[PDB]
Amino acid sequence: STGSATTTPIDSLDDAYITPVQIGTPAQTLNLDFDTGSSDLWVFSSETTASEVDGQTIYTPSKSTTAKLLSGATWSISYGDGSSSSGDVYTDTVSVGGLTVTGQAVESAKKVSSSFTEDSTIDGLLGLAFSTLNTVSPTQQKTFFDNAKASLDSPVFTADLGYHAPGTYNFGFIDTTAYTGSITYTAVSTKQGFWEWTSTGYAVGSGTFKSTSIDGIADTGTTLLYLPATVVSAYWAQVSGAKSSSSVGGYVFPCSATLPSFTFGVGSARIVIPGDYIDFGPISTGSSSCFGGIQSSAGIGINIFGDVALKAAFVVFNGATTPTLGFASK
């Protein structure tokens, strides 16, 4: 089997991407944030505190003939950005782009933090990291991909995120028409539950590539590219007027600037992030100062190849017995 679903930016800056997911019988379609940096599938629901719901589409398990309550199970998650959610647990039929999983854990939110409430476009998250990070208690549950794996033609999914445009999540096959050149594969560590790999280095604009190991995670659920302070400083030093602002909370630059590209290494291959991908717009409405899309990971504890980086590539998440990551230009 295979699945193929279009993923769409939630706003003009590609702050996140949403993908329609069918849940239950008859289908209830919710727009979820596919997150390769977490491992819970959770949704706004008929159980979410009413005052914490504002515009989202909710899952109503009592209207699904295939919903089953996982007795006594609970879940509770906290994300990098400090947002959180928690609730109880159902299993139900979940389909993504034609690919159906029966008995998928669907984590129903009783409570969500404000940043979730305040984002009317995201109805929940679908985690695609390793199931060892799943927060369901007392018994951890499997991700959509884990559950689907054995049925897929190939044990893979791919992310093809668009710059200011829709893209695609495929399950079970590699669309050889979706990238240029070849896919370069690189080793993954699952020791922290993430799609963790080691980049071979970077270049800033037309500068010569610096060979240096950068351990980090491929994370579709993080907007920006977060890298070591050395790397990030070298980048913004090439942008006139750029500086790190503690009050704004990162590197900012004049909105009139032409940003250089940023290159990261995948083995002996290279992925070039165009300068325009690194512009995340005015720091506030009407400001002539703009917020950078490459920021320091210092204080996070891990480097994160988020959307800014991933949308420059066609990315293979290879869930074979020994998992790997593949990157191609496109």
Swiss-Prot record:
It is an enzyme of class 3 (hydrolase). The active site is at 35, 199. One of its GO terms (molecular function) is aspartic-type endopeptidase activity. Residues 17-328 form the Peptidase A1 domain. One of its GO terms (biological process) is proteolysis. Its EC number is 3.4.23.22. It comes from the Eukaryota. Keywords: Aspartyl protease, Disulfide bond, Hydrolase, Protease, Signal, Zymogen. It catalyses: Hydrolysis of proteins with specificity similar to that of pepsin A, prefers hydrophobic residues at P1 and P1', but does not cleave 14-Ala-|-Leu-15 in the B chain of insulin or Z-Glu-Tyr. Clots milk. Disulfide bonds join 255-290. Belongs to the peptidase A1 family. This is Endothiapepsin. It comes from Cryphonectria parasitica. The chain holds residues 90 to 419 of 419 of the full protein.
